Design a protein around this ligand. Structure first.
Ligand SMILES: *[C@@H]1[C@H](O)[C@@H](O)[C@H](O)[C@@H](C(=O)O)[C@H]1NC(=O)CCCCCCCN=[N+]=[N-]
Ligand SMILES: *[C@@H]1[C@H](O)[C@@H](O)[C@H](O)[C@@H](C(=O)O)[C@H]1NC(=O)CCCCCCCN=[N+]=[N-]
Lengths: 457, 457
């Protein structure tokens, strides 16, 4: 093993993680099926509760430009069996209708989970008046306490690429659209909250959006995929475990926006690989390590939260399935589960030394809201075991829950705390293990391509 | 859908399925780790109970020629963490030692599960006297009620191919060995029960074995892999769903042995593809359909039982994992689960008609020991949905539990009764569905590459 030092500093205060930090993002097309986001969907509701007692459900995505609210519509027989996976971006999605029934059923789903809602409106192809009407029904049925924000279009900077607007569409044009929709909506719903611009940090769209619309939104909404442009070497597990300088830069950009406008930021759509994911990467244990680490990295940067995109049986979905067939936890879910068990609190200094031979090991220390110290570690080195000598924690007893699979590319065999997640998100730890050492010096071994959560008495 | 007819005949009596029909086979090398087959292994015990309240654990395999009992040995530190997956047959396995402690722990594992034991002795490379000593300790600790049989060597017809004996080793030579071992063992254990010859049906080994040793064994033990010789086109999902004429022939051969000697037969080692399995076939939902169907086909041929080979994280293992990391149900397990829920009873006539366009659909009807009619159906056609018109059942109510995954090659997303299996074999149905129709005419739809269990009131 590579022998590294980890030094915890209870005085090096970072950010406080909010209790609604975790979340999921889904395609708005899924709302065509009123059985999906329903009070009767107890299995899916159970998977969300396990991910956190508070969190945020975001509904939007490319399909939000192809979904059309109608106050008189009833779902058809095909609609009652629709499971809309992440949009693969290769062409126009099918047209779908959203019904009062689906909205009513969403409000019951949110009551069963305890989660809040970010809800997409159709700015790509709809009308301001139909958006106002949809926003009104959502506000009537869901309420201002569970409705966090509406968003007016998804990835407007990509409308051109995907046939929704002409090549010439730019931020100026988008700001005109945004204003027309904001104005119509606010007439019907004077207390409507908004977030935007619902894409990746950039200077042509995100920076001017925040300057112009800072008094009209509650927070900035940004997207992030670890996969870079279509021209890069395609994503591998190896690459996914390494730092992404684009991420660090886009995160800084978001912090500067915050400094300039007062607006906080949330990562409203993210996953490993775009266009639904890549088989052999996105659907593997490696995605658990990537996702768990990402949650922590963005939290330490001052992010208000996250929403991992998914649905259907897409390669990157945290939860897979249907109401007819049932739901299961995919490998990525286990990384979010580790964050769920750690809980909220305030991040602390945790400096790694002696680690140039194991450079993809990361570590985050947290003072829990219950007063206990926790450490989340991700050994993302694919070929190096580690031995971590831990100082700066005094406690009579540490325990470890391990995040494991037998290989980094496994599509199954994933456990946390020595147990799989069962039906309806059911999980409890079955193997807990004391961390050797004592107050001021603890010693933790970790295999290559594993994770761990340490909780100190 | 292809519209087919299924005609149940309560008068066309087949064989009665025994309550200990189900089972698993593992490598004897695994006995080096006393924590594996242990009373403390509650997770694995739970997966076996779910597969049936009675069944049989077989321990043997290629590693049984490389495992050496020693009455004074204690397990080492490496042994305490060994997880022995199926032997891949590419070379000699590592030498392993079996300890009293491992045997004691096995007896507690068997008490927790309610299963019986077939136990391998080392005829390949051991001595008669050490086999006698091992057989004595096993009989002392496990008892005659839970010990079903000892086996003297695994696949003796392949000893040559694999370096254990010379090219010239033949049945005559094997029969000499078998006799020397039988004689030594019976001196130490006068009531020792045996089964053999622990390979595939053939005329050079299995047929003469049964003639010569019929008064010395309780039953004939045969092996079957769907994959044929190394020279055949390699196994595909497509091929796995089709009838295997080798299987039908070897099964007939076993029935003729029974007629001639009075000896029943059990399939003591089977899976889809040999040498640990093939990735993309053995580890897929297709293996669930293949395994469930196989259980039924052999039961209808008059087999006393089955033992699916597995362990570790091998491609074909029903259950994967370790005591340190936990255990999970792989796709194949779900096929055996369907048989588990159906339960024991007596098989009935069930003739399919109008089915030349959906020729890989199979169906088995059973009068349960509780008096209710059940039908197990496997739609193994990869590209054809079916609509099954069912006659010859009178009942006020049928229900269906579905065996599903979104694609035949999926390595995960497998459900039964609308639920995954959870931790420690925990399973309950979450979606049950009434079968349309009434007494004398029921109508069941099934997707391509799915399965179903129908239970009639
Ligand atoms: C986010 C999107 O809103 C979802 O509908 C979609 O399913 C998801 C995904 O593709 O998996 C997300 N979309 C993207 O990340 C857009 C693709 C990234 C940029 C494409 C390359 C730029 N064009 N060129 N050349
Ligand atoms: C049964 C065996 O006892 C297990 O140890 C082994 O793990 C299992 C497997 O290979 O997965 C089973 N072994 C076999 O089925 C033997 C291979 C079949 C015949 C090989 C080809 C014949 N030789 N040539 N040429």
């Amino acid at each position: 093993p590579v022998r590294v030092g980890l030094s915890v500093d209870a005085s090096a205060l970072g950010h406080t993680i909010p209790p609604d930090y975790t979340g999921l993002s889904y395609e708005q097309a899924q709302m065509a099926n009123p059985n999906y986001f329903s009070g009767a969907n107890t299995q899916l509701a159970g998977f969300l509760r396990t991910l956190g007692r508070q969190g945020v459900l975001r509904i939007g995505g490319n399909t939000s430009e192809y979904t059309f609210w109608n106050r008189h519509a009833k779902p058809t027989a095909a609609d009652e069996h629709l499971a809309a996976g992440p949009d693969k971006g290769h062409h126009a999605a099918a047209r779908e209708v959203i019904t009062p029934e689906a909205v009513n059923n969403l409000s019951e789903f949110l009551d069963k989970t305890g989660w809040k809602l970010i809800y997409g409106l159709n700015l790509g192809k709809g009308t301001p008046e139909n958006a106002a009407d949809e926003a009104a029904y959502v506000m009537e049925t869901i309420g201002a306490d569970r409705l966090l924000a509406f968003q007016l279009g998804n990835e407007p900077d990509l409308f051109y690429r995907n046939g929704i607007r002409p090549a010439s569409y730019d931020f100026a044009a988008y700001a005109g659209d945004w204003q027309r929709f904001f104005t119509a909506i606010r007439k019907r719903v004077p207390n409507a909250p908004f977030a935007g611009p619902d894409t990746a940090y950039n200077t042509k769209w995100l920076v001017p959006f925040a300057d112009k619309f800072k008094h009209d939104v509650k927070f900035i909404s940004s997207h992030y995929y670890a996969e870079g442009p279509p021209t890069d070497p395609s994503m591998t597990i190896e690459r996914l475990m390494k730092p992404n300088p684009r991420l660090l830069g886009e995160t800084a950009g978001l912090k500067q926006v915050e400094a300039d406008t007062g607006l906080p930021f949330r990562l409203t759509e993210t996953n490993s690989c775009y266009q639904g994911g890549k088989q052999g990467v996105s659907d593997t244990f490696a995605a658990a390590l990537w996702a768990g680490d990402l949650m922590y990295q963005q939290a330490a940067a001052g992010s208000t939260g996250i929403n991992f995109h998914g649905g259907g049986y897409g390669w990157y979905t945290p939860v897979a399935g249907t109401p007819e067939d049932g739901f299961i936890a995919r490998p990525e879910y286990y990384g979010m589960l580790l964050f769920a068990q750690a809980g909220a609190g305030q991040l602390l200094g945790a400096k790694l030394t002696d680690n140039s031979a194991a450079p993809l090991l990361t570590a985050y220390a947290l003072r829990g809201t219950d007063g206990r110290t926790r450490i989340a570690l991700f050994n993302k080195n694919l070929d190096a075991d580690v031995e971590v000598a831990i100082s700066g924690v005094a406690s009579p007893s540490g325990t470890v829950l391990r995040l494991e699979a037998p290989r980094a590319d496994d599509t199954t065999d994933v456990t946390f705390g020595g147990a799989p997640v069962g039906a309806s998100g059911s999980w409890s730890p079955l193997v807990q293990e004391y961390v050797p050492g004592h107050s001021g010096q603890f010693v933790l071994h970790m295999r290559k391509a594993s994770g761990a959560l340490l909780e100190f008495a």
